[PDB]
Design a protein around this ligand. Structure first.
Ligand SMILES: Cc1cc2nc3c(=O)[nH]c(=O)nc-3n(C[C@H](O)[C@H](O)[C@H](O)COP(=O)(O)O)c2cc1C
Ligand SMILES: Cc1cc2nc3c(=O)[nH]c(=O)nc-3n(C[C@H](O)[C@H](O)[C@H](O)COP(=O)(O)O)c2cc1C
Lengths: 352, 359
């Protein structure tokens, strides 16, 4: 049960296994004729080449051999085992080899809970925190793990930083970042603070019966109050006047842009661009307004302070009783977070 | 594998020990003459009797023998060892193989620990990933994210590592159409965490009077009618002079938000968004504010025409005619689900903090 024995004759290859050998392997003594192939069968496949070689060398050299290996069990886990081999030399020639397979299970020393905890914590102290960085990126841009992984690799190349170095830098960079900024824009600044290229700034320009249940007399006060209280920016420009000046700006516009409604009347809305308006973008807007068509524009803008943001503003033409388009309505929206995410997908697409 | 061998002639008791046997015991081959008495001197007293018997047994029987024992080390703890004895056939001599199991035993222990570390390293990576997912999904720091993972592990009676795996697998399988915070919240509840709260509130409004700027007063109705029509947020008007405060205006942004066409809601009170599930106290708060001509903001649970729910923060602004009579009310509905979902997670952490401070 603990150990078994066999003998092989060099000349005739006659293998005689003992009753104990079958028992150490998981057999009854008489069940099977014990053979070397059967012995190898109950060894872990990693042990079979060395075990065979150990025997062949004992036959060729006659010196004793010891092989460390496992013993497979049909149901249970493998047990540590050892095989010793010795030879009988007749006239400087090996006549037979006797082998002894022993079960080392009773000599195994198991790992204490303490040393395991020490080793696990040592590894946990030296780990790369990319898994956390992976989770932050996937959730921040609502992308999957693979996509989040791909982005982190790209960002490292641009920063010329180790992949793990990017993970730590991003995490402690995000932690010290300004919480008042939205997350996606916060993360992009963390990446640019580490040498990654700033995101692109290019934009684009693309193109009521009446219920009668409101008294005509009461409509102006109702509609005036509605524009005042609306949570999105509303503006009106007199396209008949010099330089298409603004004639209305609601409080939401002040909040969005930092310019007080009073101190903006009479001016063209270009001022939101500071002195950084792109010429090609201006031509698209100017051409749209002159043509009296309805259009939507994505553009970068700036508040009365330096704070930049993406602005998707829609332009609606309004006619008078004569059918002449005399005013335009502008609907400004801060769409920074959508654009930040969409730019990351552009980046992933570019990796095709 | 460090081992040594010997051969012992039966009749003459001649003992031939290998150079390797000398080294196993702790001597260069030339330093010592190898005799059976020398071998036993490096075994522990308690092994000597069993070892001698095994050697005598293999001689008489000729049957293989194995003896477990120690090897004594000068100024060091003994090493585990094992002797194998085979006879060369009567018994002409016995071949012995003394093996030092010190290395094999040490490596097996080291391997068990390595496998353990790999298991722990895997469980740490998933917790770290889930920690990061929570951090950015709800925009909270790592301690808060980790605290919420511990909280939701407690509420679902799960171990933190099992929760982490469930959240990652579940989120991956969630419906991509749901905005992330709603999506993740339903993953926690699908795993046994209790459902989020449903109770809202109603508060007053804490400005400057409205003006129409420099819009020509004649063009104002057309200009601002167009404005309310194209605005991206919902706008509704109710006539509080008519019975049951019916809806008299609703812009397309309201139609997108609720799934109701204006034609099919004009003339009805807005309560239909509550789907007959309005909290009695919340309704009374709204009624009282309206009856008093107050400006209030209300958070309430609502449902589109298709039944799907959303958190609605809608502001109520009274409109007074020339004589000062409130004739209409304006409502601005906003889907603030994602914000509310974050506030609720933050609310769970703040509730725990208060508990720790005051118990
Ligand atoms: C009602 C209205 C609102 C506008 N709002 C914005 C805006 O928010 N941001 C912006 O960059 N341009 C806006 N524009 C465009 C500018 O006012 C300007 O007409 C356009 O950029 C062309 O500028 P240019 O005359 O310098 O080429 C708006 C135009 C109108 C008519
Ligand atoms: C302009 C306006 C908009 C409203 N919008 C909503 C809404 O979107 N969701 C909601 O639950 N209640 C809304 N209400 C409140 C209900 O229509 C109703 O006044 C309230 O539930 C009163 O309680 P009762 O229905 O029990 O009388 C609104 C009220 C007004 C005047």
């Amino acid at each position: 049960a603990s150990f078994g024995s066999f003998v092989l004759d060099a000349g005739s290859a006659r293998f005689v296994g003992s009753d104990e050998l079958a028992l150490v392997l998981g057999f009854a003594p008489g069940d099977v004729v014990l053979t070397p192939a059967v012995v190898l069968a109950h060894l872990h496949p990693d042990d079979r080449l060395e075990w065979q070689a150990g025997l062949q060398r004992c036959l060729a050299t006659g010196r004793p051999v010891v092989v460390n290996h496992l013993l497979l069990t049909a149901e249970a886990e493998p047990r540590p085992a050892m095989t010793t081999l010795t030879a009988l030399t007749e006239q400087d020639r090996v006549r037979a080899v006797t082998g002894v397979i022993t079960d080392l299970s009773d000599r195994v020393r198991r790992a204490t809970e303490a040393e395991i905890r020490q080793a696990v914590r040592a590894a946990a102290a030296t780990r790369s925190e990319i898994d956390q960085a992976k989770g932050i990126v996937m959730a921040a841009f609502d992308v999957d793990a693979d996509q989040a992984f791909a982005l982190l690799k790209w960002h490292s190349s641009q920063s010329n930083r180790k992949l793990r170095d990017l993970a730590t830098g991003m995490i402690e960079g995000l932690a010290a970042a300004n919480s008042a900024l939205p997350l996606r824009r916060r993360l992009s600044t963390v990446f640019t603070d580490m040498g990654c290229p700033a995101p692109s700034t290019k934009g684009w320009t693309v193109p009521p019966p009446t219920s009668g249940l409101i008294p005509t007399a009461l409509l102006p006060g109702i509609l005036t109050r509605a524009a005042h209280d609306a949570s999105v920016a509303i503006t009106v420009a007199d396209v008949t006047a010099p330089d298409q000046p603004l004639v209305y700006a609601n409080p939401a516009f002040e909040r969005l842009t930092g310019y007080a409604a009073a101190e903006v009347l009479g001016r063209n809305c270009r001022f939101l661009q500071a002195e950084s308006g792109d010429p090609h973008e201006r031509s698209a807007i100017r051409s749209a307004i002159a043509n009296g068509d309805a259009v939507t524009t994505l553009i970068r803008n700036f508040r009365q302070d330096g704070h930049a943001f993406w602005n998707e503003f829609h332009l609606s033409p309004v006619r008078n009783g004569a059918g002449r388009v005399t005013h335009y309505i502008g609907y400004q929206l801060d769409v920074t977070e959508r654009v930040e995410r969409d730019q990351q997908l552009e980046q992933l697409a570019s990796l095709e």
